[PDB]
Subunit: 316 residues, 6 copies
């Protein structure tokens, strides 16, 4: 017995209660022990430097997800034949105190990994990834990283404060959470202050791929290099939506011109097949800055492709 999404011949897709992919809602400790993987949300926006609004991200992603079917026509992957999956709700953060919210997040992820669940996370601003990595290292050790973004996110401070959505990866290196020689950053562009704005990462041991190197091309051959750099151990995956061009994704906090296409984004995720993935996330979707709901529709479709490449999924 494995859980399945609701079909159109059972109930029309414009109706029914709106969970992720119309799946069952599980809460008890006894039933949590029987799951292989699960969807979960974290509604925080008090770490933003420009536009707010990403507190409503998890709700709109769930609402648009009612269109998706179970079997992948292009690759042949069928995850609902192999694994047991469900929707487990949201985390209750403190919206009036930032450092108190960070404490709560680490505590709840300690409980999830205790039951043996691999998480797929709906955000939320980029500050959330720091306390998540604190719990991951306690279970697995030092990890590798594949990071998609329009910004490097390695600032020393923001308005004199140490913890914010632009300092996440500077803190991770200082706390000894990563294996520095197994890291790649893809999509960096736009303006800065000095040449050291990209050169600091290269000196630590990272490989940096700017958007100019991606223009006019397919990224199928590039991912062979990426597998060579990060492989030979456990790996985490983190995706910022502002990496994609605003023609496809207008609903976000800090947009930048001339970026990646949606075809190119599909080539990256499908090319992760063969790695030892231990967790994934999708961040920075902001509903009040897109009227059509198209940005949220894109996020749900990319989360489906992530499930398809987890270890143990059969092809038919």
């Amino acid at each position: 017995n494995l859980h399945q999404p609701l079909g159109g011949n059972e109930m029309p897709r414009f109706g029914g209660i709106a969970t992720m992919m119309r799946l069952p809602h599980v809460q008890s400790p006894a039933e949590l022990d029987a799951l292989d993987a699960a969807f979960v949300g974290v509604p925080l926006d008090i770490g933003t430097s420009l536009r707010s609004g990403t507190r409503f991200g998890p709700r709109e992603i769930r609402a648009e997800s009612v269109m998706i079917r179970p079997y992948n026509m292009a690759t042949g992957a069928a995850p609902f034949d192999s694994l047991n999956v469900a929707d487990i709700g949201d985390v209750a953060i403190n919206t009036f105190n930032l450092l108190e919210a960070v404490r709560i997040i680490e505590q709840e992820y300690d409980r999830i990994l205790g039951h043996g669940i691999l998480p797929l996370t709906l955000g939320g601003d980029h500050t959330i990834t720091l306390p998540i990595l604190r719990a991951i290292k306690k279970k697995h050790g030092k990890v590798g990283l594949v990071h998609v973004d329009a910004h490097a996110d390695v600032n020393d401070h923001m308005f004199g404060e140490k913890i914010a959505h632009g300092t996440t990866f500077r803190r991770a290196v200082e706390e000894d959470l990563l294996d520095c020689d197994r890291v790649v950053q893809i999509g960096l562009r736009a303006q800065g202050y000095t040449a050291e704005d990209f050169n600091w990462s290269r000196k630590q041991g990272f490989r940096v791929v700017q958007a100019e190197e991606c223009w006019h091309k397919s990224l199928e051959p590039l991912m062979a290099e990426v597998r060579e750099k990060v492989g030979g151990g456990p790996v985490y995956l983190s995706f910022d939506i502002d990496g994609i061009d605003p023609a496809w994704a207008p609903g976000t906090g800090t947009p930048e011109i001339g970026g990646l296409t949606t075809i190119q984004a599909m080539e990256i995720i499908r090319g992760c097949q063969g790695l030892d993935l231990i967790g994934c996330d999708l961040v920075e979707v902001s509903p009040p800055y897109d009227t059509t709901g198209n940005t949220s529709l894109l996020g749900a479709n990319l989360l489906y492709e992530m499930l398809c490449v987890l270890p143990g999924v059969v092809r038919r």
Copy 2:
């Protein structure tokens, strides 16, 4: 131990799964036997004559309802300390055949009344009220009526067809479902073909109140006349959203200028206190014609006022 809505100190209101008023989702036969009343939806729009879109009605009303609290500051009513209430989901209609859909509605409402539950319905176009009244009459006998609308809805045909959203109450009289001496219609205005468009109702025994009789006035004295006319037995309440002026409710299928205010709408519902109510509905909300979400927020608040005046509710 009665059901209660989720509080803001447990989980912030922009988070959590979106059921009506964030209540439990009841599905088992044993749990259905223990309920006094419940919210339920019917997503149909294939009976409309102008704009479509009311199939998404029940989904948006649930989403905006997250801000309602349980105690009435003005009247003192407290329904959740008196009755056992929950959310029971949607009815699975056939969107490709209109006559088959009408059959499905009567069948499912026969089962709901079998468990001993009083229904509060979310629509959906005005064709739904006909098969609902068929099930009511079998249980209680002939009933009275309070009807709020900008139109009469008593046409003999529409493009040659007998069953449509503008013929509902003509069919109800021919089938012997109503007590003709206990009926009132409130809000009628705009254009027609001849004088018989309003005079047909008066001939059958109904009392008609045109919008011109409502301008510049408080409606507390009017509702005293209403209670004297329709009292002495059981009664049903049916509310079309297009009775209210488009300045307050722009998202609907057939709008008409110069109508009732939201202050006057509150005076109507609160004035039903004392009657033997056996069921209620709220129809014709259409999401894609109002981008702010304000029309759906209005609908959720009015449904709460309806719950406060049911028989058996205590005051503190």
Copy 3:
């Protein structure tokens, strides 16, 4: 046989070619000689001082008019049983030269009045009313006036130029076109420079009714006073849409807070019954500043009430 609008049982109201009220389109010399009244448009916006866009006015009004039925339930008026009416198209203005556009307008209205037709005009900014009144005097002589607006429109100049949308009624007085002892202005409010901004009109002989005199009241008693002041000869009616409060009409060039309601606007037009009317207009609707289409819908419904009160209409 007289012309009739297209009915619903002939073709559904969402289809068909989009003329005003779905009426015939008339062009020949013989067919023009046989009409008692007609609808006509003038698409000009090069005389505006803040927001532009009223050039699209005539097109959106026609599109929202498809809802209107032919008989008046409240008053009993039936215009299509007594008069011969149709749609005669638009005037071909020069959008690159303002003074040349003014010359074209006077010439074409000389032709319309030569056929014996009474015009009902769709605008367009308020500059159009000057060359229209020039043609009216040639046929009828000096006339009285009923004027609804939030502004006085009696400036001596605008950026040094003599002809603009805020100088219209200053020029009409200087050119000896009006009977000064038969004029009323209704709805003026907001800010100015000195007390003479409203007092100049009073010195000429006009009556001025400020918005403060209208607050909280029905306007039926006021219109009894108005009829005795302006009666005894021919009269023209001119309606600027910014007279109505922005809660009902946001799509306009220069809006002002705290104005008249739609109920009050209906009381003004219905109270003109009994006067010798020779022409009417409805100006300043701007489509790109209202996304719902509600401002254009209000405009079409008010023009129908204007048709109902013309001399020669039968009651049934």
Copy 4:
């Protein structure tokens, strides 16, 4: 005599009555006999499975078409010098009964072909193509097909019903309307249930081209293979708007990510030159789900390119 679109020096393009490309409206029997080709509309949406609204499709396409000029700069084609063309209105469907509407469509297309006119159709959902093909076969016999879509549309049933917008081309094979060896389908993608969802078509004799085969490329060499396959007889062209990526076409019923560009769409239509075309259509545009009008403007421009490639048109 030859019909021509209205020029800018006669009347500014934001003015005048809104027919397709501002052409004459033809209604009499004598004038219908003299036409070589014509534009016509069918406003139906009661066969949709997700979002509704394509009933307003034909009205918005006409309104945005006021921009187009007669001469093709790239190809040298000039259709208005070789053929006599006009706008003939809409078909009067029954919006309360699906099977009754299907009967009406076949009967009215029998009359159109009786005058000897070649049709270019504005939709409307994809159910309309079935009864159109029933009428075409009676005049020409069995035909070949070029089909552009994101979906296969070969279902056996939908919620138990045989006639719906996803069963169209399954019914055509069973009724013997096509030559199975002269058919191509271009653009299919996304999720399904089993591998047989694409392989059923291949077993019948069709060639299938998935979106992955199209990425990063020019489509000029592909269309040379297409002309060889379907040539040697009469052929029909059918275009579903959801074949194009949502970055360009957000206003539609069932969107899917990562599709074709507008450059690739022009390469397909221009590549049909030399074939014996007998009819064309453009379906599934839904106005209430796009807030700019950009989806309707694209539809109007693609229909102009279809006109340029008909037999009889000369190059200069």
Copy 5:
């Protein structure tokens, strides 16, 4: 010499740098000494319980203000002939730490009062009023209060925290900042938990005026009673925009149905003439939840009426 706003005959109102009412921007110490009053902004939103976005409040209010003229036609007030006024910019808050932001606000207002300036403040959420009152008391002593809102704002905690946007006036009583016998609250409505939610304020010494007491009437007689209650010393004025009905002001954080009109709001402010006012504010405007820009336009016009009633203004 006194500062004046820019006129239309110098530069058209759609052009020029967008300061408040197009006034000079003052920065130097010597020029600050010579001002009688000034406009100033505080862009904070990290204290909100539901919707965020009021950080952009000050920017949109400035842009919509380019319409206002200097002389009051109804009251005859002329503030620019009596006082010296300008725009002085924004306060630089810390958006990553809430308690540090409160410290910064108190320090800067100590400086503004040191130059001898009376402040008119643009917000910003309701947490800002607490540090402002801490600075007022040092100069003047304890003060009276006129407060317009749909909520009481007297909570002890929010999610366990003492300082938030719903606890403002509870902290003010504890710290001895007010004279409890000279306070009035106007406009409270909707749902709660117990009767004590409104009863606490009555026992302290306040007068409470619910929305039900205001329905259907003019507020001229009420304001005469208010002047008697709060007169005798210095007084502050605080205006929450959610006190007005959502038909006029949809762009706000926590909306509630059935409220005050804009006519009633005008009667309140104009009725303050004669009191010893020492400061004013206008809070909670949120731009991303109102696309038209009408909520911001309302806020700018209400601020002008506040300037007219300050002590020392002449009438002509």
Copy 6:
């Protein structure tokens, strides 16, 4: 010391007065003589032939520009370490008379060049470029030109008038302002009347590059040929926003399908390095036809790339 833009550690980017890139505002004769270059605006829209609204162009471009940082990561350019730059305001045009507005433009640009300043212009419709070139020729002599557009703009007349937004470059040839052997036009497409619509330019000595020559290609090799053709003397750059595909830039007056990408636009500007540029402009942005603000954000970012390639700028 040279002028610098404001940083985030001084004041958060959602606050502060909105000048271009948050730079100082310069007005005095003494401070003007000290500037090497400056930003300046011209708000005209009375010469358009379809949609109006580009009068608000300069205001929205300023508001979105608050995001830009000073150092170019890709090229290494640093303009703020080399040149002295500021914001100098708008030109006061006559919105009621087109010919008088043209006289005003030429006069003010004579004064700007008299101070020795190189201009970077914000528009405004394409009529403004004619009077600008009249003042340029008086100072420098005959000049070369790089022109980006979807249209040729070489009409002899519009509606009988010789000065309009589509005749600009025809007038420039007749008045002897250009070196005809040093001109290139890039991006022309869509429909016309005859083959001479593009062939007139070829006969004068121009090179024409149509859109079909740009499809599927990088534009680096093209710009090497362009530099050879126009070099060896002073040169002007003019950029019409409708040259880019409507997927990226929907807010414009006359849009055409299937154009250039934003990647291709970046390759054009960066490829101008090495030329003797004397002035630049960016025209035809219309805010009310794009609600997201994305069209204005694109315009601001392109103007920064123009500043980076001026003679005298150093690389690091």
